[PDB]
Design a protein around this nucleic acid. Sequence first.
RNA 1: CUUAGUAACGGCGAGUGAAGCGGCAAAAGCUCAAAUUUGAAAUCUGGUACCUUCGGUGCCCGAGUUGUAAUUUGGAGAGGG
RNA 2: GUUCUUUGUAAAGUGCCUUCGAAGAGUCGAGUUGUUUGGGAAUGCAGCUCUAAGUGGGUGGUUCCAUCUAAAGCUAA
Lengths: 235, 244, 161, 159
Amino acid sequence: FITRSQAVRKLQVSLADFRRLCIFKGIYPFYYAKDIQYLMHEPVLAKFREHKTFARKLTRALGRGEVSSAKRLEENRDSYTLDHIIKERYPSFPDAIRDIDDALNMLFLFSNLPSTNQVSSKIINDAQKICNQWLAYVAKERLVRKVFVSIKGVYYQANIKGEEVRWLVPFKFPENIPSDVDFRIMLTFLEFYSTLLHFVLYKLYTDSGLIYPPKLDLKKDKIISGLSSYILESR
Amino acid sequence: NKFVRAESIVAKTLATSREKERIKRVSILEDKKAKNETQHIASGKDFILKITEGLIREKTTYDGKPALLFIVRVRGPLAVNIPNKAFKILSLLRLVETNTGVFVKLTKNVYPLLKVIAPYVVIGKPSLSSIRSLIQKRGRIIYKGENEAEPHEIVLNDNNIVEEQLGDHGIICVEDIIHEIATMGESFSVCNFFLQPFKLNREVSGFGSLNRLRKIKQREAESRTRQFSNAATAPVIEVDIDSL
Amino acid sequence: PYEPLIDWFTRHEEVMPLTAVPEPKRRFVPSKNEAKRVMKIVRAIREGRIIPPKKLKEMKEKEKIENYQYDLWGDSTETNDHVMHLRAPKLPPPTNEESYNPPEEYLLSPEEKEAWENTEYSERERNFIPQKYSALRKVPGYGESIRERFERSLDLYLAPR
Amino acid sequence: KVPPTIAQFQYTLDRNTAAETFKLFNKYRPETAAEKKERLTKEAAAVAEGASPKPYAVKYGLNHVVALIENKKAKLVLIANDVDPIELVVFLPALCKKMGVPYAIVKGKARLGTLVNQKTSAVAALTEVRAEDEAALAKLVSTIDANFADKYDEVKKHW
RNA sequence: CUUAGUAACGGCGAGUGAAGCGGCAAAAGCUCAAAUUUGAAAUCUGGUACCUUCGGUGCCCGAGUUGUAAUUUGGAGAGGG
RNA sequence: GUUCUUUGUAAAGUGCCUUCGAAGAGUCGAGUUGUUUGGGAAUGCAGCUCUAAGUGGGUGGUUCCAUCUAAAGCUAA
């Protein structure tokens, strides 16, 4: 085992970024020595370093007064992808559907959020898009078993490849965001669960169902922006 | 409490000179349009510009039909202090705060007042989803707190709060408020002053690395997607509120 | 030791420039170095080794649309619970009898409503007061919902398994 | 103890004037190496398939400048005080005085570098100017001659 | 090779001891620093992807205006016609 | 020899006419202490003191005349 301090120091990475990688990799506490010792060689850590280089090289351009080169630095920017991070976390598809329990709870909460200076509108619109894709599929292939309306929200149970997932949807009212909660921890969980859901939904649609991603009717999205909108075709 | 530079203090007056003269100019032509003394003015009718998205500028005349608008506060232009005629209209629409929306119906009385505040507001006819998502995402109610405190503005969490405050007008729930807002009815003047204004978050929302550059990109997108006509025959710029 | 520098030479301003050098044609004519570079890129476009700026938009209008749009599992039989060190994150307890319309014996007594509020958080059986509602329209938006997911998120990576 | 022709520097241009200098000067940025390249690729795309005027940008090499002062091409000259060998510029404020070319010691050698795509510059000068800003320049010049040349007539003296 | 054991020096003594010319061997010349590319640092290191790999190319990064390229070195040379 | 490609108002050369036209400083030089020589016009070098010029400067020959251009660099046989 190793202490948090010893893990942070060994990685030569910030605590925030240590915790970001810990969220992505599914690492939990004393940490396991071989777990941190296995985190050290990883593409995501290298891409975090690249983001740090990009950050200063952009503020160099902005701070001087040149705007065109800064705008060009945005064009020549690649970002870290959480693709290979799931293969090593959930190697089988039934294992990923065992995690989607907790994954769909964040994502359906983040749909029912007013956008703040913490969380951009693009983040909430993409999260809501995935939510609507999930709702569309479960209503398409007819996979509901149990419902439960509580004070908290509305619970559902769904035999998704025959393993009974559970997930919670809040009521469609404005939600009072406390200043107490940390919208930097939750954003990385969203960032991991989001990509996880993209790959799950591709696997589900391309196996038994439909084309991915489906289109949405513009004048249907103008009426409801819910579930009667977003038409989806089989072949 | 800071020192004020000379350049700024002359810039404010130099911009309000343009705004006082502009507002008086629009005031004269709109007063002379209503009294049917159209003998020698620029134009005796009302155009509306609808800019959509590669930026097509439409030129359509305003019908007598009552329409539904969602006015959004902007912050513009730069050095301007608001005059008396702007203080009045923006008090009546309760839009003193930046990044703040409100619903109003547009008639032949509403449209002349719209030309005055057009450099301060961005207007447009919203859709059913824009209205419905806006009310279920944002909503304030000014009413009494625990026992003593009055000025609490909380949230549209409940429907029984809707009952206690409206009720007898036929309104029972939040979705019924959405009904009387989307469709122009009897209870619209009742519920419009119940959701007083909306609190829209600002664009980009930061000063830093990524956020300054994104604000630069959007700031140059402003003057392309919005123009200040300044003339007494200013066509009212309508934009897509579904996109905004 | 410190005399003022009496500018015995700069006192009188010069009329003419120092040298009578004839100005070259290139200072008035469009530049030939620019012409050389242009007529080098021209060759590179004929050869096809520089793709023109007009087509570079078309190379990105067709590409980078498809993100996360491939199967990664496929025929995947391998389980990750092979080393005994993978502690599966424990799916949260199924919700037991606290609905919008409960049997009202679950509805808490007025003494325990404040006693529940007296107890410190996280050493508490329910994260909520059980409440009775006649209508489904009368169900409030539950305010302490972001707090619950945030605390679960913290429980995943900070709480020892 | 400083000999008068050294610390003819340190008595630089004031705050309000300085910003207004850059207000002008940032208008005359040289094209960036990225920008220049794309411009020419824009040309190559065009000229491979199917007129321009001379471009004003400020002038920036110490050589180029010392050429330009003494040849009368120069109108305004900006000279940074802190330089690794001070000697590399000490003559320069006098040369300009002698050719009657308006000059101002600016503060921040890096600050010159900003307006010119470089790390530092020691000296930059605006030779030729656009039609609209022609008046803006000649006024700035006068402003500089008042608050710098006339204000510090005793900069050639006093240790 | 010769000049030459000469000139020249040396308590003119032990003595020290050249060079130019002349004849041959071999032969080959050149590069900077110097005044502005200023109508566009036009130059290079590296990293990276390819390619026909003692290298070439694209793309990015830097170095560099306190000067890196082209032109010029007195035999002139440069600007123009 | 055999071919494949050569390009751009590209790179030079020659003659004439016109318009200009910058070349190395703690160095040269001078004083002195040592070193080197067979060196008589301390030659060469070092140390130390001082330290320049541009119709200049360095070196030689009977009052001029000839000769080169230091204080940067490379190079076969």
